[PDB]
Every structure is written in structure tokens, then in C-alpha cells.
Design an enzyme around this catalytic site. Structure first.
Site, PDB file in Angstrom:
ATOM      1  N   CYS A   1     -10.488  -4.526   5.633  1.00 13.53           N
ATOM      2  CA  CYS A   1     -10.013  -3.156   5.407  1.00 13.53           C
ATOM      3  C   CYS A   1     -10.977  -2.071   5.879  1.00 13.53           C
ATOM      4  O   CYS A   1     -10.594  -0.881   5.983  1.00 13.53           O
ATOM      5  CB  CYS A   1      -9.709  -2.926   3.901  1.00 13.53           C
TER       6      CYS A   1
ATOM      7  N   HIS B   1      -9.676   4.599  -0.814  1.00 14.94           N
ATOM      8  CA  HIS B   1      -9.314   3.304  -0.256  1.00 14.94           C
ATOM      9  C   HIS B   1      -7.976   2.866  -0.888  1.00 14.94           C
ATOM     10  O   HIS B   1      -7.061   2.430  -0.176  1.00 14.94           O
ATOM     11  CB  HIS B   1     -10.441   2.301  -0.541  1.00 14.94           C
TER      12      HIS B   1
ATOM     13  N   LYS C   1      -2.289   5.606   1.252  1.00 15.65           N
ATOM     14  CA  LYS C   1      -1.641   4.302   1.406  1.00 15.65           C
ATOM     15  C   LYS C   1      -0.327   4.223   0.626  1.00 15.65           C
ATOM     16  O   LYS C   1       0.534   3.399   0.916  1.00 15.65           O
ATOM     17  CB  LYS C   1      -2.564   3.153   1.015  1.00 15.65           C
TER      18      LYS C   1
ATOM     19  N   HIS D   1      -0.890  -0.459   3.914  1.00 14.89           N
ATOM     20  CA  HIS D   1      -2.245  -0.857   4.256  1.00 14.89           C
ATOM     21  C   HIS D   1      -2.249  -1.517   5.644  1.00 14.89           C
ATOM     22  O   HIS D   1      -1.796  -2.641   5.775  1.00 14.89           O
ATOM     23  CB  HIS D   1      -2.730  -1.862   3.220  1.00 14.89           C
TER      24      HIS D   1
ATOM     25  N   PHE E   1     -12.927  -0.069   1.611  1.00 12.28           N
ATOM     26  CA  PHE E   1     -13.667  -1.103   0.863  1.00 12.28           C
ATOM     27  C   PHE E   1     -12.968  -2.429   1.109  1.00 12.28           C
ATOM     28  O   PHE E   1     -11.941  -2.734   0.478  1.00 12.28           O
ATOM     29  CB  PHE E   1     -13.753  -0.765  -0.633  1.00 12.28           C
TER      30      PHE E   1
ATOM     31  N   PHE F   1     -12.034  -6.493   1.844  1.00  8.87           N
ATOM     32  CA  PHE F   1     -12.107  -7.863   1.412  1.00  8.87           C
ATOM     33  C   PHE F   1     -13.395  -8.495   1.928  1.00  8.87           C
ATOM     34  O   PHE F   1     -13.806  -8.253   3.085  1.00  8.87           O
ATOM     35  CB  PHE F   1     -10.873  -8.587   1.956  1.00  8.87           C
TER      36      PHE F   1
END
EC number: 2.3.1.41
Lengths: 404, 404
Positions: free
Chosen positions: B163, B298, B328, B333, B390, B392
Site C-alpha cells: 500500500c 491511509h 478510499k 484501495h 501504511f 502490508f
């Protein structure tokens, strides 16, 4: 500005599972290439590979390994080795905002991507896929799977640039030190070895196909009858460290990274332009006040590529060209892992004072004439070494490393 | 130290195929999310996505597009837009060692990784795979497929960090300017939209499944009944340029990049730590002498992730929250493309003086009290904006952008 040195290394390669084994192979000119039933069974024309000869089962904690594809496994083992080699305690490197990780793969995990798609297409759907495929298949798998268990707090990402991947990772680590942002960056990469990915390269005619009955002879950089590269897998990691920090802790310093070139051809998708490579080498040599004693070439064993790089070397060095060898003739081409593994071979040559041979040259290509392509192991007190990585997409990296 | 500004932008998103459509969607709070028969047919539980609503047929020349996956298509179109927006002639940016490209994807091309393996297993083997799969499937596809046709001679590689991918690309472009290595770097990313990749996320329970009958309500960051993110695709590109260079050529400057944080959680592989985000935001704000007016979070619409980020925001800002919205909720996303697309949304808010709404919050999370989450389009003069990414694997990026 701040200076960057290499204070530890780790490697899992077709020619050895640690630096002792690798050193022995390099000195002996020992091939890491074997016949692959997997590749043959898949229907490929290339039946040879540079495989990792290591049972990795149980070498990594289950809570850690459950997220990993092979590229991450190889990089993780390489990182463990590099931390031990560097003499770093967890007190020193864990939970430390000044300690980072930049490590990547060229392909991610085509194996687990295909596993996920195959599983999803069966009767059990999501249940057959299971919950671990993203971290295995995502492009940043190598960085993500290592930053957690090693408790890294600083930079954490993957660079990818095909054959140049782990060379740009090392260069970016140098930049972090130069910017004053990090004291230590673990840099490197990993690549799995699988028909799922290898068949893509065979389909573009990139792999050796004429030497399957004699696998050790297939990879043959500079030989007149070379016919493509031999695909390989593995990992490597180096500890890139700011100079004063290294000295303060009594680090063992292999070498200073005194040059880092990175350029782009902006010409062809799969063939090198030459012009980009010349700029890349010159960039890496700018302000380096010592001659290159040894050059570890990109040299993949391809008709066009091998000699394109040699023409660039002649332009860069004029009438003072360095000793050259292409260690891919021994190891094969580990793609995303190649940059860091070849930096490691170059560092071992520098540390132990020898040049590894360019093997399998039965007839030297006419375009290689007049250059000191070293074909027998040679003891020599080296000071400054260069390693080139020139990837698909016209992406170029060169690293220059020098004794401190 | 050299300063970096943004002088052009380009975008293909679920909410618009150029900056005019995107600006209109942002002001209107218009959802880009639709029902996907593809996802449903594949056996997934999540049947909604943020798709690119654009027929790309014939937009890119046959000989260029033959090497490309959808991520590269979207990034390429975004780059064309960004070039026009920056007023750069071919002579200005082509065949120029001072001009680079850093652009990536989170997944590469799962579709083409799978295509290769499926083709290989069929009756035509290598002939069905064909010669174009490596450039479509490799992790560096987006950089490789753009650097060549745009004749880029400077840096050329991809960063991947899930991301955070294209946010780190932008940050690394800034670093190239700061180090004096490049005058212009095109930075951004792309992501394909496909069941091959989406099913991996659904298999780990990450995607929204309870709202398929009302796709526009599925993505609902900060809502008490959120149930996972809505996957999206697209691309974005910004022109990152050294300040004096931009002024000297009469560029239009949107904003200066006055902060860039990149950190790592080093904690739990699965969830964001919170502390990593705090450290990232603080790093980006270091030395910035003006308040953060607006924060593009995020916030992906996940139970754990959303409130972790809110807690980090409270730690950084205390009782002086910026205006916050999670775009989002409108866009879904787009993984590797999210960082650059959200920097672009933030730049449009800064340029046009409004705050885009955080939509679909029917019941604010019991743990989101005491902040300024903006749920209605609000005209306001902004000066300094922040965008968080932020990823994965505990990988964090934050960008801070300010009017000159």
C-alpha cells in the site's frame, strides 16, 4: 558527505550455502549448474538451472516462515548470516530507527501466484487458497517477510529492476547513509527457482537450450557458442553501514562503496544499448582515484549482451582495461539475487586476494579479444573492484568497492 | 539542500480518467465503486471494486503496448498526462541523463504470471506463452515499460512496498533531487484489477463482503460496520522537479515536498503497529514550520487498520487534529497506485482550496472521537497537507506538501 562500508555478508547460492562454501567454489571454478527434471517435465527447451542445494525445512521459525516464498527464505537465511558476520547484537540493531532494510526480487513469487489462481479455480475456491498467499506473492515479499522478524524500524521496502534489482538495493542503502538518515541498512535480495517463472524466459528465447546433456557447460559467457543464460535462484544480503558508526563498534570492514552508478537506456526492452552502460560505469567511477583492478561483469552468456557490455567496457577504460571475469558461467543468473550475490563474490575476491575464473571459454568470442578475461584462478592483491548489473527494461547499475 | 517541487500530475482512477474528472468526483463525494461480475464469477465473496472506466483500446502504440500489463498501461497514460501538465516537450525530458523514472506496482501482474503458467500447460507450450510475458509479469514492469518509450536516461527502477509503493517512489524521487543526482524524476505507480490478485486478499479476509448489493456503501472508512477494503486499480504519476530548475523554465508549481517519512513497524506481520505510523508522521513533519491543515489518511475500511491509524494521529497531534478524510471510502484501495493517487487528491485539494469528504460514515467508530473527520465537502484555504500510506508488512510512508 557520509561514507558507506560493508561490514557483513550472507549468501545462499548455487555455488554454496554460506561464504565459506562460496569462497571454495570461486577458487575451484566449480559449476553450480545441474540438470532439472522439473524444467524438462514442464515442456521447456532449457533443462538446466543453478539450484540451491540446501534443505531449508525447519531453518526458520514457523510463525515467520508461514508468510514466505522461497525468495524470502533465501534472503532471510542470508540476512541471518550477515548479522552474525557483522557481529551485531539485537540490542544494537532491533527497534532502532536508524537501521533499515532494502531488499527485493525480480519476479516475486510466480509459484505462489499460480498456486493461488489454480487453487481458486478448483471446487474449494477461497478455502483452497488459504490466508498466506499475499505475502508470498506480492512484489515486496522479501522486504516485508524480513523486516518483521528482524524488528527493523527504519526504511523497509523492495527495489525491483530485473537483473539489476539487488544492485540498486545496495546503491539505495548507500544513499540512505549519505543522506544521514540511517546508520545501517541491510541490502540484498532473493529469487525463487521454478518452471512457472523460467518458462517466461525460455518463451522469449533467453535461456540456454543446446547443452542440456552437459549442464556444467551450458553457462559459458564469452564463448563463441554461447546460447543464452542459465536461470538460477538464491539470496544474498550485505550490511551497509556508515563509516564512523562501523569504526566506533570495531566492525570488520570488507570495503567502502566508493561508487554507485544507476542509469537508463531509454532504447530497447530486452537488449542493452551500450550507451547507458557507459554512462553507468563512468558515474560509478566519478571521483574514484584508483584504477579498477577487477571487474565482475554482468555477462549472462547471451550472444548480443556479452559483447555489448565488452564494447562499453572498452569505451570506458580506453587502453587500461581491468581484469574481467563473468562468474555467471559458474553460478547461472539468479535475476533479483544477482546484484548482491555478485557484489559478495567481488568482496570475497577483494578480501582474499584472488580473481575467480571465467569458465567454459572453449573459443573466445572475437569481440572479446585483447581483454584480460581471466580463465584460471589467479592470486592477486586487489584494491578496487567493480560489479555491473544490466537488467531488462534498459535499467543499469554499477557498484565500485574499495579497501579502506 | 536541494528542494523538490511537483510541477505536473496525471491520473487514471476509479473516480476519474484525468485531473478534471477526479476534482469533480472529490468535490461531489462521488463513489468509484461498482459491482463486478468478474469477481463474482471467480468464486469470491467480495463482488465490488474500484474499476477504471475507460476503454484503453488504441491509446498506446501497438509496438509499445505489446510489452505492457494493465498496471503499465495505467501508469503510461498517467505519465502522458503528467508530461503535458508539466509543459515538457520531448526535447526537455527525453535522452536526458538528468531525468529519471521511479514507479512501481504492489502486485506486478498476477494476471500475466498466471497467463504464462496456463499457456505453458496447454497444447502450444512456449508458443502460447509468447515473448512478452517477462515484461508484463516482472516486478519492475511499470518502470521498464515506461522508461523505454519515454526515452528516459536517468534513474530507472521500481519500488514495491504494498500500500505504500508509490508513496515511497515519490519519496525516493525527492531523495534523487536532494542528492543532486536528477533534475526531474517522474514518480508514481500502477495496479491492475483482476480476480487473480483480488482472490488472494479475499482468502485472507481482507476485502468487504457484506455490501455487494450496495457497492457504493461497501468502502466505509471509520464506520462502525466496516468489514474490509474494496480493491481497486489504476495509475498515477507526478513530475518531481528540483526547485531552481522548475522556476528557471517557467513551470507551474503545485507544491513543495517539505517532508517525507519512511519507517518500519518491525512488529506484528498482520496488523499495523501504530507506533510505526507515529514515527513516520513525526519524521515527515520534522522541520516543517507550519501546521498540518489537512490529512489524507491511509484508512482502508478495515476494523483493525482504521483505528490504529486514528490512535497514531492522536499521539502525533494531540488535541490539535488536522482536518482528516479517507478518500478510499470513495475510491477503494488501488494498492501500488494508492500513494501517488492520494498525493494527487491531496495536491488537488491544496490547489483548489477544499477538503474532500470522508463518505459512508453512518455510525462513527466508538474509538474515533475527538478528531476532525470531515464528512462534507468543505471549501477552505489550505497551505500544508499530509498523506499517509501504511503498507502490508509494516512498511510506512508519509508525504507532506506545502504551497511555495
Amino acid at each position: 558527505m557520509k561514507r558507506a562500508v560493508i561490514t557483513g555478508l550472507g549468501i545462499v547460492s548455487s555455488i554454496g550455502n554460506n561464504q565459506q562454501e562460496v569462497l571454495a567454489s570461486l577458487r575451484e571454478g566449480r559449476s553450480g549448474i545441474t540438470f532439472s527434471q522439473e524444467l524438462k517435465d514442464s515442456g521447456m527447451r532449457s533443462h538446466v538451472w543453478g539450484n540451491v542445494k540446501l534443505d531449508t525445512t525447519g531453518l526458520i521459525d514457523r510463525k515467520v516462515v508461514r508468510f514466505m516464498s522461497d525468495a524470502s527464505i533465501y534472503a532471510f537465511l542470508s540476512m541471518e548470516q550477515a548479522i552474525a558476520d557483522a557481529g551485531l547484537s539485537p540490542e544494537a540493531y532491533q527497534n532502532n530507527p536508524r537501521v533499515g532494510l532494502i531488499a527485493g526480487s525480480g519476479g516475486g513469487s510466480p509459484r505462489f501466484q499460480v498456486f493461488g489462481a489454480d487453487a481458486m479455480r478448483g471446487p474449494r475456491g477461497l478455502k483452497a487458497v488459504g490466508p498466506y498467499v499475499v505475502t508470498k506473492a506480492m512484489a515486496s515479499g522479501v522486504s516485508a517477510c524480513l523486516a518483521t522478524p528482524f524488528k527493523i524500524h527504519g526504511v523497509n521496502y523492495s527495489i525491483s529492476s530485473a537483473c539489476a534489482t539487488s544492485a540498486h538495493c545496495i546503491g539505495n542503502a548507500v544513499e540512505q547513509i549519505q543522506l544521514g538518515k540511517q546508520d545501517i541498512v541491510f541490502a540484498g535480495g532473493g529469487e525463487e527457482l521454478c518452471w512457472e517463472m523460467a518458462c517466461e524466459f525460455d518463451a522469449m528465447g533467453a535461456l540456454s537450450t543446446k547443452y542440456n546433456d552437459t549442464p556444467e557447460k551450458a553457462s559459458r559467457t564469452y564463448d563463441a557458442h554461447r546460447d543464452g543464460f542459465v536461470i538460477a535462484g538464491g539470496g544474498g544480503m550485505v550490511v551497509v553501514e556508515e563509516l564512523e558508526h562501523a569504526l566506533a563498534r570495531g566492525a570488520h570492514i570488507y570495503a567502502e562503496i566508493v561508487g554507485y552508478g544507476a542509469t537508463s537506456d531509454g532504447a530497447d526492452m530486452v537488449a542493452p544499448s551500450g550507451e547507458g552502460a557507459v554512462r553507468c560505469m563512468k558515474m560509478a567511477m566519478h571521483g574514484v582515484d584508483t584504477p579498477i583492478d577487477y571487474l565482475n561483469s554482468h555477462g549472462t552468456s547471451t550472444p548480443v549482451g556479452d559483447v555489448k557490455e565488452l564494447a562499453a567496457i572498452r569505451e570506458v577504460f580506453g587502453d587500461k582495461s581491468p581484469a574481467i571475469s563473468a562468474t555467471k558461467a559458474m553460478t547461472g543468473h539468479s535475476l533479483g539475487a544477482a546484484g548482491v550475490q555478485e557484489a559478495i563474490y567481488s568482496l570475497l575476491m577483494l578480501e582474499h586476494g584472488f580473481i575467480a575464473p571465467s569458465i567454459n571459454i572453449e573459443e573466445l568470442d572475437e569481440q572479446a579479444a585483447g581483454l584480460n578475461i581471466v580463465t584460471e584462478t589467479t592470486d592477486r592483491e586487489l584494491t578496487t573492484v567493480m560489479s555491473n548489473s544490466f537488467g531488462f527494461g534498459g535499467t543499469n547499475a554499477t557498484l565500485v568497492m574499495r579497501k579502506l
